[PDB]
Write an enzyme that holds these catalytic residues in place. Structure first.
Site, short mmCIF file in Angstrom:
data_model
loop_
_atom_site.label_atom_id
_atom_site.label_comp_id
_atom_site.label_asym_id
_atom_site.label_seq_id
_atom_site.Cartn_x
_atom_site.Cartn_y
_atom_site.Cartn_z
N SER A 142 35.65 55.33 70.83
CA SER A 142 36.42 54.33 70.07
C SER A 142 37.85 54.16 70.50
O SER A 142 38.55 53.31 69.96
CB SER A 142 36.45 54.69 68.59
OG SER A 142 35.17 54.45 68.00
N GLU B 290 29.36 48.31 70.83
CA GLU B 290 28.84 49.32 69.92
C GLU B 290 27.39 49.02 69.55
O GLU B 290 27.02 47.84 69.36
CB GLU B 290 29.71 49.40 68.65
CG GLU B 290 31.21 49.58 68.89
CD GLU B 290 31.64 51.04 68.99
OE1 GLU B 290 30.79 51.91 69.27
OE2 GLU B 290 32.84 51.32 68.79
C1 2RG Z 1 33.97 55.39 68.01
O1 2RG Z 1 34.46 56.59 68.60
C2 2RG Z 1 32.83 55.57 67.01
C3 2RG Z 1 33.41 55.88 65.62
N1 2RG Z 1 34.77 56.46 65.80
C4 2RG Z 1 34.92 57.47 64.96
C5 2RG Z 1 36.18 58.32 64.98
O2 2RG Z 1 37.05 58.01 65.81
O3 2RG Z 1 36.29 59.25 64.18
C6 2RG Z 1 33.71 57.68 64.03
S1 2RG Z 1 33.98 56.87 62.40
C7 2RG Z 1 34.85 58.13 61.37
C8 2RG Z 1 34.27 59.52 61.53
N2 2RG Z 1 33.02 59.43 60.75
C9 2RG Z 1 33.44 58.77 59.50
C10 2RG Z 1 32.29 57.93 58.84
O4 2RG Z 1 31.12 57.98 59.23
N3 2RG Z 1 32.73 57.21 57.80
C11 2RG Z 1 32.04 56.39 57.01
C12 2RG Z 1 32.34 56.41 55.64
C13 2RG Z 1 31.68 55.55 54.76
C14 2RG Z 1 30.75 54.65 55.26
C15 2RG Z 1 30.45 54.61 56.62
C16 2RG Z 1 29.42 53.61 57.13
O5 2RG Z 1 28.89 52.86 56.30
O6 2RG Z 1 29.17 53.56 58.34
C17 2RG Z 1 31.10 55.47 57.50
C18 2RG Z 1 34.63 57.86 59.88
C19 2RG Z 1 32.61 56.95 64.82
C20 2RG Z 1 31.81 57.89 65.72
C21 2RG Z 1 32.03 54.26 67.09
C22 2RG Z 1 30.86 54.18 66.11
O7 2RG Z 1 32.92 53.14 66.93
#
Ligand code: 2RG
Length: 265
Positions: free
Chosen positions: A42, A140
């Protein structure tokens, strides 16, 4: 010895670790595997928001973007909440940086436009900043899934540090857009346990994190000493030795950042 400390951390976490801090007036560049490729994950969202800010009038932030079920394909803590009403470009930039929202990043890529769902234009934006190394090839969630060593969707600690430096400290953006980006990163919610944990409370930290498969954990930051002296800090890691499901380990980045802060204080 700093290189020795970084090697101790790699053995501790069965990880590969990359560190770069650009040289300043009186501090030499800090570099450890700084020219090896690591997945963006990210962390690309920081220059993505810069690209979108650069490309449009400031009030493009007030344009409402609508999306639906089939647009939510990755971790999206904010976009999932607003699917019924839409989100402005400003909201998307905010979600992309502060919550690392994946849907917001995809919608922002689509806003930027052109080939590869916006990935070619994103890469072209880095090229304009003199980054001839980094590349974004997928959106993504596929961008976090390239196998270890694969150059797709990668940057290096060195390349991304110099990009962030130009965005936040230099003149890549006009002052008003530069402040928008800086403030979003200042207000990040995902970074408390990474570069932030390594620096004392009286140092200002702004950042954008990344997390992915093969135990990938990145953080890119700008930090300011208690006297307002700025430094750019890029820390990237993977634990590819554990396979696809290896756990990302934030503590590694916190420890590496502590080592860096030790040198810069
Ligand atoms: C990019 O690296 C990747 C994102 N980036 C992240 C990071 O930099 O930490 C995480 S998201 C971050 C860590 N996990 C939590 C999470 O899952 N939060 C959350 C809370 C409520 C609801 C939801 C949902 O509905 O999805 C999520 C926040 C991640 C690996 C990619 C995917 O862009």
């Amino acid at each position: 010895d700093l290189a020795d400390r970084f090697a101790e951390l790699e053995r501790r976490y069965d990880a590969r670790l990359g560190v770069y801090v650009p040289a300043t007036g009186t501090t030499a560049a800090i570099e450890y595997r700084a020219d090896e490729r690591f997945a963006f994950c990210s962390t690309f969202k920081a220059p993505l928001v810069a690209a979108v800010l650069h490309q449009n009038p400031l009030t493009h932030l007030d344009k409402l973007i609508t999306y639906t079920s089939d647009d939510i394909r990755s971790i999206s803590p904010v976009a999932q909440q607003h699917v019924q009403t839409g989100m402005t470009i400003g909201q998307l930039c905010d979600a992309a940086i502060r919550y690392s929202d994946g849907t917001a990043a995809n919608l922002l890529l689509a806003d930027l436009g052109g080939p590869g769902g916006g990935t070619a234009a994103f890469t072209g934006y880095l090229r304009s900043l003199g980054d001839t190394v980094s590349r974004l090839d997928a959106e993504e969630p596929e961008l976090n899934r390239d196998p270890p060593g694969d150059e797709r969707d990668t940057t290096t600690p060195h390349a991304i540090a110099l990009v962030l430096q130009q965005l936040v400290l230099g003149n890549a953006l006009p002052p008003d857009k530069r402040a928008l980006l800086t403030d979003w990163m200042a207000r990040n919610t995902t970074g408390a346990k990474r570069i932030r944990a390594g620096f004392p409370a009286d140092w200002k930290v702004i950042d954008k994190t990344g997390t992915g498969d093969y135990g990938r954990a990145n953080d890119i930051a700008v930090v300011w000493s208690p006297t307002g002296v700025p430094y750019v800090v890029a820390v990237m890691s993977d634990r590819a030795g554990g396979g696809y499901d290896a756990e990302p380990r934030e503590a590694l980045l916190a420890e590496a950042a502590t080592c860096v802060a030790g040198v810069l204080a």
